[PDB]
Amino acid sequence: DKITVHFINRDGETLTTKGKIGDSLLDVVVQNNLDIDGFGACEGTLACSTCHLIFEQHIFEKLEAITDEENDMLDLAYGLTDRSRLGCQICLTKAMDNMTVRVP
Ligand code: FES
């Protein structure tokens, strides 16, 4: 199944695209060639902070439990919020249809 995801880019523009249930948010950016500068540098291997996304609170609270490995890297991210995750760790579910995520 596919869902719609909106990305607010760091230039304030919204990029709307579709992703498949089970794909990571990095897969969504890559597969759809979204023009988000520098996003996903390390290719989803927890060796960068560049796939950092800011979530809506209601989505964030139902995401999978964060690992220490993700958290340690995420701690170093520019514009870290209490609703932040590394996007390459987050896989799409139907709860996320029409959600908005933001790139700081
Ligand atoms: S793409 Fe590097 S940790 Fe997510």
Curated annotation (Swiss-Prot):
Q: Which residues are listed as membrane-spanning?
A: none
Expression by tissue, per the entry, reads: Detected in adrenal cortex and corpus luteum (at protein level).
Q: To which protein family does this belong?
A: Belongs to the adrenodoxin/putidaredoxin family.
Which cofactors is this protein said to need? [2Fe-2S] cluster
What this chain does, per the entry, is described as: Essential for the synthesis of various steroid hormones. Participates in the reduction of mitochondrial cytochrome P450 for steroidogenesis. Transfers electrons from adrenodoxin reductase to CYP11A1, a cytochrome P450 that catalyzes cholesterol side-chain cleavage to produce pregnenolone, the precursor of most steroid hormones. Does not form a ternary complex with adrenodoxin reductase and CYP11A1 but shuttles between the two enzymes to transfer electrons.
Which residues are recorded with the post-translational modification N6-acetyllysine? 2
- N6-succinyllysine PTM positions: 2, 94
Question: Which GO terms of the cellular component aspect does the record hold?
Answer: mitochondrial matrix; mitochondrion
Q: Where in the cell is it found?
A: Mitochondrion matrix
Higher taxonomy:
Eukaryota, Metazoa, Chordata, Craniata, Vertebrata
Gene Ontology BP annotations = cellular response to cAMP; cellular response to forskolin; cholesterol metabolic process; electron transport chain; hormone biosynthetic process; P450-containing electron transport chain; respiratory electron transport chain; steroid biosynthetic process
Q: Which molecular-function annotation in GO is an example for this chain?
A: 2 iron, 2 sulfur cluster binding
> How are cofactors bound according to the entry's free-text note?
Binds 1 [2Fe-2S] cluster.
Q: Which residues of the full protein are shown?
A: 63 to 166 of 186
- Binding of [2Fe-2S] cluster: at which residues? 42, 48, 51, 88
Keywords associated with the record: 2Fe-2S, Acetylation, Cholesterol metabolism, Electron transport, Iron, Iron-sulfur, Lipid metabolism, Metal-binding, Mitochondrion, Phosphoprotein, Steroid metabolism, Steroidogenesis, Sterol metabolism, Transit peptide, Transport
Protein name stated in the entry:
Adrenodoxin, mitochondrial
The 2Fe-2S ferredoxin-type domain is annotated at 3-104
Q: What is its main location?
A: mitochondrion
Q: What does the record note on quaternary structure?
A: Interacts with CYP11A1.
